[PDB]
Coordinates of C-alpha atoms and ligand atoms in Angstrom, one line a residue:
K2 CA -12.4 -13.9 -7.2
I3 CA -9.1 -15.5 -7.9
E4 CA -8.6 -18.2 -10.6
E5 CA -7.7 -21.8 -9.8
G6 CA -4.6 -23.5 -11.2
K7 CA -3.0 -20.1 -11.6
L8 CA -0.8 -17.9 -9.4
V9 CA -0.7 -14.1 -9.8
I10 CA 2.3 -12.3 -8.3
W11 CA 2.5 -8.6 -7.3
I12 CA 5.9 -6.9 -6.7
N13 CA 7.2 -3.3 -6.6
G14 CA 8.1 -2.0 -10.1
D15 CA 11.7 -1.1 -9.0
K16 CA 12.5 -4.6 -7.5
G17 CA 13.2 -6.4 -10.7
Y18 CA 9.9 -7.9 -12.0
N19 CA 11.3 -9.3 -15.2
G20 CA 13.8 -11.5 -13.2
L21 CA 11.0 -13.0 -11.2
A22 CA 9.1 -13.8 -14.4
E23 CA 12.0 -16.0 -15.5
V24 CA 11.6 -17.9 -12.3
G25 CA 7.9 -18.2 -13.1
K26 CA 8.4 -19.3 -16.7
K27 CA 10.5 -22.2 -15.5
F28 CA 7.7 -23.0 -12.9
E29 CA 5.2 -23.1 -15.7
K30 CA 7.5 -25.1 -18.0
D31 CA 7.8 -27.8 -15.3
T32 CA 4.4 -27.7 -13.5
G33 CA 2.1 -26.3 -16.2
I34 CA 0.7 -23.6 -14.0
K35 CA 0.8 -20.2 -15.7
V36 CA 2.2 -17.8 -13.1
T37 CA 1.7 -14.2 -14.0
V38 CA 3.9 -11.5 -12.3
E39 CA 2.6 -7.9 -12.3
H40 CA 3.7 -4.6 -10.6
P41 CA 0.8 -2.3 -10.0
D42 CA 1.3 1.4 -9.1
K43 CA 1.3 1.7 -5.3
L44 CA 0.6 -2.0 -4.6
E45 CA 1.3 -1.4 -0.8
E46 CA -2.0 0.6 -0.8
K47 CA -3.8 -1.4 -3.5
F48 CA -3.3 -4.8 -1.9
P49 CA -5.3 -4.3 1.3
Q50 CA -8.0 -2.5 -0.6
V51 CA -8.6 -5.5 -2.9
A52 CA -7.6 -8.2 -0.4
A53 CA -10.4 -7.2 1.9
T54 CA -13.0 -8.1 -0.8
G55 CA -11.4 -11.6 -1.2
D56 CA -9.7 -10.5 -4.5
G57 CA -6.2 -9.6 -5.4
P58 CA -3.1 -11.7 -6.3
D59 CA -2.0 -15.0 -4.9
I60 CA 1.5 -13.8 -3.8
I61 CA 2.3 -10.3 -2.5
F62 CA 5.8 -8.9 -2.3
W63 CA 6.8 -6.1 0.1
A64 CA 9.0 -5.3 3.1
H65 CA 7.9 -6.9 6.4
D66 CA 6.6 -3.6 7.9
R67 CA 3.4 -3.7 6.0
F68 CA 2.7 -7.4 6.5
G69 CA 1.6 -6.9 10.1
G70 CA -1.3 -4.6 9.3
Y71 CA -2.3 -7.1 6.6
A72 CA -2.6 -10.3 8.6
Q73 CA -4.2 -8.3 11.4
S74 CA -6.9 -7.4 8.9
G75 CA -7.1 -11.1 8.1
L76 CA -5.7 -10.7 4.6
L77 CA -2.6 -12.9 4.9
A78 CA -2.7 -16.7 5.2
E79 CA -0.4 -18.0 7.9
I80 CA 2.6 -20.0 6.7
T81 CA 4.0 -23.2 8.3
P82 CA 6.9 -24.5 6.2
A83 CA 8.9 -27.7 6.9
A84 CA 11.2 -28.3 9.8
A85 CA 14.2 -28.1 7.5
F86 CA 13.1 -25.1 5.4
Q87 CA 13.5 -22.5 8.2
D88 CA 17.1 -23.7 8.6
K89 CA 18.3 -22.5 5.2
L90 CA 17.4 -18.9 6.1
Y91 CA 18.9 -16.7 8.8
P92 CA 16.9 -16.8 12.0
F93 CA 16.5 -13.1 12.4
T94 CA 14.8 -12.9 9.0
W95 CA 11.9 -15.0 10.4
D96 CA 11.7 -12.6 13.3
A97 CA 10.6 -9.8 11.0
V98 CA 7.8 -11.9 9.5
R99 CA 6.5 -13.2 12.9
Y100 CA 3.3 -11.4 13.9
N101 CA 1.5 -12.5 17.1
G102 CA 4.0 -15.3 17.3
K103 CA 3.0 -16.8 14.0
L104 CA 4.8 -16.7 10.6
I105 CA 2.9 -14.7 8.1
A106 CA 5.2 -14.5 5.0
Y107 CA 8.3 -15.9 3.4
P108 CA 11.4 -13.8 4.1
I109 CA 13.6 -13.2 1.0
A110 CA 16.2 -10.5 1.1
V111 CA 17.4 -7.8 3.6
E112 CA 17.3 -4.2 2.3
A113 CA 19.2 -1.2 3.6
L114 CA 20.0 2.2 2.1
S115 CA 23.6 3.2 1.2
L116 CA 25.5 6.2 -0.2
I117 CA 26.1 6.0 -4.0
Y118 CA 28.8 8.4 -5.1
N119 CA 30.4 9.1 -8.5
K120 CA 34.1 8.4 -8.4
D121 CA 35.0 10.7 -11.3
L122 CA 33.4 13.8 -9.8
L123 CA 34.1 12.8 -6.2
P124 CA 37.3 10.8 -5.5
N125 CA 36.6 10.1 -1.9
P126 CA 33.0 10.3 -0.5
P127 CA 32.1 12.6 2.4
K128 CA 32.2 11.0 5.8
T129 CA 29.7 13.4 7.4
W130 CA 26.6 15.3 6.4
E131 CA 27.8 18.8 7.4
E132 CA 30.6 18.8 4.8
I133 CA 28.2 18.6 1.8
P134 CA 26.9 22.3 1.6
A135 CA 30.5 23.4 1.0
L136 CA 31.0 20.4 -1.4
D137 CA 27.9 21.4 -3.4
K138 CA 29.1 25.0 -4.0
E139 CA 32.3 23.5 -5.4
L140 CA 30.3 21.3 -7.9
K141 CA 27.8 24.1 -8.4
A142 CA 30.6 26.3 -9.9
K143 CA 31.4 23.4 -12.3
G144 CA 27.8 22.8 -13.5
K145 CA 27.0 19.8 -11.3
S146 CA 25.5 19.2 -7.9
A147 CA 26.6 17.3 -4.8
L148 CA 23.5 15.3 -3.8
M149 CA 20.1 14.5 -5.2
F150 CA 17.9 11.8 -3.7
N151 CA 14.2 10.9 -3.5
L152 CA 12.5 13.4 -1.1
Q153 CA 8.9 12.4 -1.8
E154 CA 9.2 9.1 0.2
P155 CA 10.2 9.3 3.9
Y156 CA 12.1 5.9 3.6
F157 CA 15.1 7.7 2.0
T158 CA 15.1 10.6 4.5
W159 CA 14.7 8.5 7.7
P160 CA 18.4 7.7 8.1
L161 CA 19.1 11.4 8.7
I162 CA 16.1 11.9 10.9
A163 CA 17.0 8.9 13.1
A164 CA 20.6 9.9 13.3
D165 CA 20.6 12.2 16.3
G166 CA 17.7 10.4 18.1
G167 CA 14.6 10.2 16.0
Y168 CA 12.6 6.9 16.2
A169 CA 9.2 5.5 15.2
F170 CA 7.7 3.7 18.3
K171 CA 9.6 3.1 21.5
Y172 CA 10.6 -0.6 21.7
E173 CA 11.0 -2.0 25.2
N174 CA 10.2 -5.3 27.0
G175 CA 9.6 -6.8 23.5
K176 CA 6.6 -4.6 22.7
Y177 CA 6.3 -1.4 20.7
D178 CA 4.7 1.5 22.7
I179 CA 2.4 3.3 20.2
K180 CA 1.9 6.0 22.8
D181 CA 5.7 6.9 22.8
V182 CA 6.4 8.3 19.3
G183 CA 9.8 9.9 18.7
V184 CA 9.3 11.9 15.5
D185 CA 9.2 15.3 17.2
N186 CA 12.2 15.1 19.6
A187 CA 15.5 17.0 19.3
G188 CA 17.1 14.3 17.2
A189 CA 14.3 14.2 14.7
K190 CA 14.1 18.0 14.5
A191 CA 17.8 18.4 14.0
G192 CA 17.8 15.9 11.1
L193 CA 14.9 17.4 9.3
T194 CA 16.1 21.0 9.9
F195 CA 19.4 20.2 8.2
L196 CA 17.5 18.7 5.2
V197 CA 15.4 21.9 4.9
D198 CA 18.6 24.0 5.3
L199 CA 19.8 22.2 2.2
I200 CA 16.6 23.3 0.4
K201 CA 16.7 26.9 1.6
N202 CA 20.4 27.3 0.5
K203 CA 19.5 25.8 -2.9
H204 CA 21.7 22.7 -2.4
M205 CA 18.8 20.4 -3.3
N206 CA 15.4 20.8 -4.7
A207 CA 12.3 19.7 -2.8
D208 CA 10.6 18.7 -6.1
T209 CA 13.2 15.9 -6.5
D210 CA 11.7 12.4 -6.6
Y211 CA 13.0 8.9 -7.3
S212 CA 13.2 9.3 -11.1
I213 CA 14.6 12.8 -11.1
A214 CA 17.3 11.9 -8.6
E215 CA 18.1 8.7 -10.6
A216 CA 18.1 10.5 -14.0
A217 CA 20.3 13.3 -12.7
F218 CA 22.9 10.8 -11.2
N219 CA 22.9 8.4 -14.1
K220 CA 23.5 11.3 -16.5
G221 CA 26.4 12.7 -14.4
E222 CA 24.7 15.9 -13.1
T223 CA 25.1 15.1 -9.3
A224 CA 28.1 13.9 -7.4
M225 CA 26.2 11.4 -5.2
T226 CA 22.8 10.0 -4.3
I227 CA 21.1 7.7 -1.8
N228 CA 19.3 4.6 -3.0
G229 CA 19.1 0.8 -2.3
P230 CA 20.5 -2.3 -4.0
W231 CA 17.7 -2.2 -6.6
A232 CA 19.3 0.8 -8.4
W233 CA 22.7 -0.7 -8.9
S234 CA 22.0 -2.2 -12.3
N235 CA 20.3 1.0 -13.6
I236 CA 23.7 2.7 -13.1
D237 CA 25.5 -0.3 -14.6
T238 CA 23.7 0.4 -17.9
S239 CA 25.2 3.9 -17.8
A240 CA 28.9 4.6 -17.9
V241 CA 28.9 6.3 -14.4
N242 CA 31.9 5.3 -12.4
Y243 CA 29.9 4.9 -9.2
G244 CA 30.7 3.6 -5.7
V245 CA 28.5 2.3 -2.9
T246 CA 29.7 3.1 0.6
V247 CA 28.5 3.9 4.1
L248 CA 26.0 6.7 4.8
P249 CA 27.4 10.1 6.0
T250 CA 27.3 10.8 9.7
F251 CA 25.0 13.5 11.2
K252 CA 26.2 15.3 14.4
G253 CA 28.9 12.7 14.6
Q254 CA 26.2 10.0 14.8
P255 CA 25.8 7.2 12.3
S256 CA 22.7 7.3 10.1
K257 CA 20.0 4.8 11.2
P258 CA 18.2 3.5 8.1
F259 CA 15.1 1.5 8.6
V260 CA 16.1 -2.1 7.7
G261 CA 13.6 -3.6 5.3
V262 CA 13.1 -7.4 4.8
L263 CA 11.4 -8.2 1.5
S264 CA 8.8 -10.8 2.2
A265 CA 6.3 -13.0 0.3
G266 CA 2.8 -13.2 1.6
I267 CA -0.1 -15.5 0.5
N268 CA -3.6 -14.1 0.2
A269 CA -6.0 -15.7 2.7
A270 CA -8.6 -15.8 -0.1
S271 CA -6.3 -17.6 -2.5
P272 CA -7.6 -21.1 -3.6
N273 CA -4.1 -22.2 -4.6
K274 CA -2.8 -21.6 -1.0
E275 CA -0.6 -24.8 -1.0
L276 CA 0.2 -24.5 -4.7
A277 CA 1.8 -21.2 -3.9
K278 CA 3.7 -22.7 -0.9
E279 CA 5.8 -25.1 -2.9
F280 CA 6.5 -22.5 -5.6
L281 CA 8.3 -20.0 -3.2
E282 CA 10.0 -22.9 -1.4
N283 CA 11.3 -24.8 -4.4
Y284 CA 11.6 -22.1 -7.1
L285 CA 12.3 -18.8 -5.5
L286 CA 14.2 -19.9 -2.3
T287 CA 16.7 -21.7 -4.5
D288 CA 20.1 -20.4 -5.6
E289 CA 19.0 -20.1 -9.3
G290 CA 15.8 -18.2 -8.7
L291 CA 17.4 -15.5 -6.5
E292 CA 20.1 -15.0 -9.2
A293 CA 17.5 -14.4 -12.0
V294 CA 15.8 -11.7 -10.0
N295 CA 19.3 -10.3 -8.9
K296 CA 20.4 -10.2 -12.6
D297 CA 17.5 -7.9 -13.4
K298 CA 17.7 -5.6 -10.3
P299 CA 19.8 -6.6 -7.3
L300 CA 18.1 -7.8 -4.1
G301 CA 20.8 -6.8 -1.6
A302 CA 21.6 -9.2 1.2
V303 CA 19.4 -12.2 0.6
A304 CA 18.3 -14.5 3.4
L305 CA 19.2 -17.8 1.8
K306 CA 22.4 -19.0 3.5
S307 CA 23.4 -20.8 0.3
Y308 CA 23.3 -18.0 -2.3
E309 CA 24.2 -15.2 0.2
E310 CA 27.7 -16.6 0.9
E311 CA 28.4 -16.7 -2.9
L312 CA 28.0 -12.9 -3.4
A313 CA 28.8 -11.9 0.2
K314 CA 32.1 -10.6 -1.0
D315 CA 30.3 -8.0 -3.1
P316 CA 31.7 -4.5 -2.1
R317 CA 28.2 -3.1 -2.7
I318 CA 26.5 -5.8 -0.5
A319 CA 29.1 -5.4 2.2
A320 CA 28.3 -1.7 2.4
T321 CA 24.6 -2.4 2.5
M322 CA 25.1 -4.9 5.3
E323 CA 27.1 -2.4 7.3
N324 CA 24.5 0.3 7.0
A325 CA 21.9 -2.2 8.2
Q326 CA 23.8 -2.9 11.4
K327 CA 23.9 0.8 12.4
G328 CA 20.2 1.1 11.6
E329 CA 17.3 -0.8 13.1
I330 CA 14.8 -3.4 11.8
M331 CA 11.4 -2.0 10.9
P332 CA 8.5 -2.8 13.2
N333 CA 5.7 -5.0 11.8
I334 CA 3.0 -3.5 14.0
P335 CA -0.2 -2.4 12.1
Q336 CA 0.4 1.3 12.9
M337 CA 3.4 1.4 10.5
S338 CA 1.1 2.5 7.6
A339 CA -0.2 5.5 9.6
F340 CA 3.4 6.2 10.8
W341 CA 4.9 6.3 7.2
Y342 CA 2.0 8.6 6.1
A343 CA 2.5 11.0 8.9
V344 CA 6.3 11.3 8.2
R345 CA 5.7 11.5 4.5
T346 CA 3.5 14.5 4.9
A347 CA 5.9 15.9 7.5
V348 CA 8.9 15.7 5.2
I349 CA 7.1 17.0 2.1
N350 CA 5.5 19.9 3.9
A351 CA 8.8 20.7 5.6
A352 CA 10.8 20.5 2.4
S353 CA 8.3 22.6 0.4
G354 CA 8.0 25.2 3.2
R355 CA 4.3 24.6 3.6
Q356 CA 5.0 24.5 7.3
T357 CA 8.0 24.8 9.6
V358 CA 10.0 21.9 10.8
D359 CA 8.5 22.0 14.3
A360 CA 5.0 22.3 12.8
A361 CA 5.4 19.4 10.4
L362 CA 6.9 17.1 13.1
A363 CA 4.3 18.2 15.7
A364 CA 1.5 17.3 13.3
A365 CA 3.3 14.1 12.5
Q366 CA 3.6 13.3 16.2
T367 CA -0.2 13.2 16.7
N368 CA -0.9 11.8 13.2
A369 CA 1.3 8.8 13.8
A370 CA -1.4 7.3 16.0
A371 CA -4.3 8.5 14.0
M372 CA -6.5 6.2 11.9
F373 CA -8.4 8.2 9.2
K374 CA -5.6 10.6 8.1
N375 CA -4.4 8.3 5.3
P376 CA -7.0 8.4 2.5
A377 CA -5.6 5.3 0.8
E378 CA -5.8 2.8 3.7
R379 CA -9.0 3.7 5.5
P380 CA -12.0 1.6 6.7
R381 CA -14.4 1.3 3.8
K382 CA -17.0 -1.1 5.2
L383 CA -18.9 -0.8 8.5
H384 CA -17.4 -4.0 10.1
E385 CA -13.9 -2.6 9.2
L386 CA -14.7 0.6 10.9
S387 CA -16.0 -1.1 14.1
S388 CA -13.1 -3.6 14.2
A389 CA -10.6 -0.7 13.7
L390 CA -12.2 1.4 16.4
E391 CA -12.7 -1.7 18.6
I392 CA -16.2 -0.4 19.3
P393 CA -19.4 -2.4 18.5
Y394 CA -22.0 -1.3 15.9
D395 CA -24.5 0.0 18.4
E396 CA -21.9 2.3 20.0
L397 CA -20.9 3.8 16.7
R398 CA -21.8 7.5 16.0
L399 CA -22.0 7.8 12.3
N400 CA -23.6 10.9 10.7
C401 CA -25.3 10.9 7.3
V402 CA -23.1 12.3 4.5
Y403 CA -26.1 14.3 3.2
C404 CA -28.0 15.6 6.2
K405 CA -25.3 15.2 8.9
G406 CA -27.8 13.4 11.2
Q407 CA -26.6 10.5 13.3
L408 CA -27.7 7.1 12.1
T409 CA -29.8 4.9 14.4
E410 CA -29.0 1.3 15.3
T411 CA -31.2 0.0 12.5
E412 CA -29.7 2.4 10.0
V413 CA -26.2 1.3 10.9
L414 CA -27.3 -2.3 10.4
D415 CA -29.0 -1.4 7.1
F416 CA -25.8 0.4 6.0
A417 CA -23.8 -2.8 6.5
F418 CA -26.3 -5.2 4.9
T419 CA -26.8 -2.9 1.9
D420 CA -23.0 -3.1 1.4
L421 CA -22.4 0.6 1.4
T422 CA -18.9 2.1 1.6
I423 CA -17.9 4.6 4.4
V424 CA -17.6 8.2 3.1
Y425 CA -15.0 10.5 4.6
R426 CA -15.4 14.3 5.0
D427 CA -12.7 16.2 6.9
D428 CA -11.1 12.9 7.7
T429 CA -14.2 11.8 9.5
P430 CA -16.2 8.7 8.6
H431 CA -19.8 9.2 7.4
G432 CA -22.6 6.9 6.4
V433 CA -26.1 7.6 5.1
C434 CA -29.6 7.6 6.6
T435 CA -32.6 5.7 5.2
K436 CA -34.3 9.0 4.1
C437 CA -31.3 10.4 2.2
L438 CA -30.4 7.0 0.6
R439 CA -33.8 6.3 -0.9
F440 CA -34.3 9.9 -2.0
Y441 CA -31.1 10.4 -4.0
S442 CA -31.5 6.8 -5.3
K443 CA -34.8 8.0 -6.9
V444 CA -33.3 11.4 -7.9
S445 CA -30.5 9.3 -9.6
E446 CA -33.1 7.3 -11.5
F447 CA -34.9 10.4 -12.6
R448 CA -31.8 12.1 -13.9
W449 CA -29.2 9.4 -14.9
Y450 CA -31.4 6.6 -16.3
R451 CA -29.7 5.2 -19.5
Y452 CA -31.5 2.1 -20.6
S453 CA -33.1 -1.1 -19.6
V454 CA -32.4 -4.7 -20.7
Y455 CA -33.5 -8.3 -19.9
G456 CA -31.3 -10.4 -17.7
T457 CA -30.8 -12.9 -20.5
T458 CA -29.6 -10.1 -22.8
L459 CA -27.4 -8.6 -20.0
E460 CA -25.5 -11.9 -19.8
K461 CA -24.8 -12.3 -23.5
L462 CA -23.5 -8.7 -23.8
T463 CA -21.2 -8.8 -20.7
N464 CA -20.3 -12.4 -21.5
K465 CA -20.7 -13.2 -17.8
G466 CA -23.3 -15.0 -15.6
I467 CA -26.0 -13.0 -13.9
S468 CA -24.9 -14.2 -10.5
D469 CA -21.5 -12.6 -11.2
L470 CA -22.8 -9.1 -12.0
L471 CA -23.4 -6.7 -9.1
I472 CA -27.0 -5.6 -9.3
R473 CA -28.4 -3.3 -6.6
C474 CA -32.1 -2.5 -5.8
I475 CA -33.2 0.5 -7.8
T476 CA -35.0 2.0 -4.8
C477 CA -33.1 0.7 -1.6
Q478 CA -29.7 -0.2 -3.2
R479 CA -29.5 -3.6 -1.6
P480 CA -27.4 -6.0 -3.7
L481 CA -29.7 -8.5 -5.3
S482 CA -29.3 -12.1 -4.3
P483 CA -29.1 -14.8 -7.0
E484 CA -32.7 -15.8 -6.1
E485 CA -33.8 -12.1 -6.7
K486 CA -31.9 -12.0 -10.0
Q487 CA -33.6 -15.3 -11.1
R488 CA -36.9 -13.5 -10.2
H489 CA -36.3 -11.0 -13.1
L490 CA -35.6 -13.8 -15.5
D491 CA -38.7 -15.8 -14.8
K492 CA -41.0 -12.8 -14.6
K493 CA -39.5 -11.2 -17.7
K494 CA -38.7 -8.0 -15.8
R495 CA -35.9 -5.9 -17.2
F496 CA -32.9 -4.6 -15.3
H497 CA -32.2 -0.9 -15.4
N498 CA -29.0 1.0 -16.0
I499 CA -28.8 4.2 -13.9
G500 CA -25.6 6.1 -14.3
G501 CA -23.7 3.1 -15.6
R502 CA -24.9 1.0 -12.6
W503 CA -27.2 -1.9 -13.2
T504 CA -30.3 -2.1 -10.9
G505 CA -33.2 -4.4 -10.2
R506 CA -35.8 -4.9 -7.5
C507 CA -35.4 -6.9 -4.3
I508 CA -38.0 -9.0 -2.5
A509 CA -38.9 -6.1 -0.2
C510 CA -39.3 -3.5 -3.0
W511 CA -40.9 -5.8 -5.5
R512 CA -44.5 -4.7 -4.7
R513 CA -44.4 -1.6 -2.4
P514 CA -47.9 -1.8 -1.1
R515 CA -50.2 1.2 -2.0
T516 CA -50.3 2.4 1.6
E517 CA -46.9 4.1 1.2
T518 CA -46.2 7.4 -0.5
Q519 CA -43.7 8.2 -3.2
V520 CA -40.3 9.2 -1.9
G521 CA -39.9 12.9 -1.1
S522 CA -37.7 13.0 2.0
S523 CA -34.4 14.9 2.1
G524 CA -33.1 15.0 5.7
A535 CA -26.1 21.4 -12.6
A536 CA -26.2 20.6 -8.9
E537 CA -25.5 16.9 -9.5
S538 CA -23.0 16.8 -6.5
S539 CA -25.5 14.5 -4.8
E540 CA -24.9 12.0 -7.6
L541 CA -21.2 11.9 -7.0
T542 CA -21.8 11.4 -3.3
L543 CA -24.1 8.5 -3.9
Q544 CA -21.5 6.8 -6.2
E545 CA -19.0 7.0 -3.3
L546 CA -21.5 5.2 -1.1
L547 CA -21.8 2.4 -3.6
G548 CA -18.1 2.1 -4.5
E549 CA -16.5 4.6 -6.8
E550 CA -16.7 3.1 -10.3
Ligands
LIG1 O1 8.6 5.4 2.5 C1 7.6 4.7 3.2 C2 7.8 3.2 2.8 O2 9.1 2.9 3.3 C3 9.5 1.7 2.7 O3 9.2 1.6 1.4 C4 10.4 1.4 0.7 C5 10.5 -0.1 0.5 O4 10.4 -0.7 1.8 C6 11.8 -0.2 0.0 O5 12.1 -1.5 -0.2 C7 11.9 0.5 -1.3 O6 11.0 0.0 -2.2 O7 11.5 1.9 -1.3 C8 10.3 2.0 -0.6 C9 10.2 3.5 -0.4 O8 9.5 4.1 -1.5 C10 8.8 0.6 3.5 O9 9.2 -0.6 2.9 C11 7.3 0.8 3.3 O10 6.8 -0.1 4.2 C12 6.9 2.2 3.5 O11 5.7 2.4 2.9
ZN2 ZN1 -29.4 11.9 5.9
ZN3 ZN1 -35.1 -2.9 -2.3

């Protein structure tokens, strides 16, 4: 459910959202369409969750690596601009947004990590990585540190891991081989072991995240840090005499940062699909719109040929553009979400000592191709599970979350038609059988019944129409059709609130002929109620 005549924009909270709002306010002052820009927490995981249900924003902003898994799930609307529009951007920026030979987003700016050093504490920056442990002990005796950067996200650590030979998926003959993963080779191990050696020798702290590393550098407590173009203005507010230069070398090899291309996607369920096309083309992809976002938090090396040449002489942009040449462009295959999750748990568990470097990377090697390891992005509905597994519904082997018995063909169908969400235990998808579902639905009515109300009253108190409220069957949990909801209104039968959920009775459960028995099948102690709420969508 997305409004008409209105565009909602989502962007990362560190990419300068207030600058994009200025571009939107001029779009509303000229076109009359109120464009709202927001920045949700973890929008790269929250977007596919809410885009699958046809909801979400109209415009999604992120690097190109996540856009492949979106459009593959049918979440991104394809884009076909004009014959003269593709010419004002660099051609390699469109390559990063081309999935299955079709454009899926609007390329904006090219991102790449760089070294950020304090010129007062550190006159000349270190050229290599190995010369930092000795440099830290010099600053340690003065009360400061050498380096502090975000260790909780693998994007900042990847340049060191890819330095001696680590890679994501082998790229050859124009295709990425998801079978050949290079996160556990000698190059990857050497890069991560050197990072853990910095933690063991107490040169860095594994607890350091983006804010801690940023607050410690902007206060003057660390000599240098690793970040992107978005953090330049945050140091400009402080009086830190900083410098942006090339990344240090590891084993004499250049660091290989994963080059990110910030892109703009349009939700396939957005009614204003062409209203959002002319906005990005005529208001963001102009020289003034990019400057407003760059004044807030810098975008790096933008793709627009016009405005890029103006600030191409930037000593910070030149260093970012050089780090991008020695790195490599991020793949846009759908497996990138599972890859980043495997490396993130590999780096964190290796930094904290939860497991050795070999153990973390070996687990990451197998988890890079897995599907259910990432709890955020995971098949929630049955058709998503079958499409992800590439197996039909009758070949699925789903056990009940309660009794661990395998569902039959008809129960798998019932699970999908009832709009039940897949439940995961030990990273394994589960469903629910007919016996367990109708039992705990009645146990829930016996224990967590709150109140009942007429459908006419329910509208006036939620100030929403009855066909917009999700009402499930009190006995079989099937979502009531608009015709079944109108059934309660005409017959003057109240709806029932069980545990905060509103329920009614569908066509099949309206009578329940006498020949049937009351439900008694099962194959504080409220844990069954929490499991049921997972099956219905965690409120
Ligand atoms: O760390 C995994 C993460 O890496 C990148 O995320 C970057 C984002 O791309 C950068 O532009 C910047 O925002 O920092 C993020 C790291 O926290 C990839 O862009 C993203 O696909 C991936 O999840
Ligand atoms: Zn069961
Ligand atoms: Zn029913």
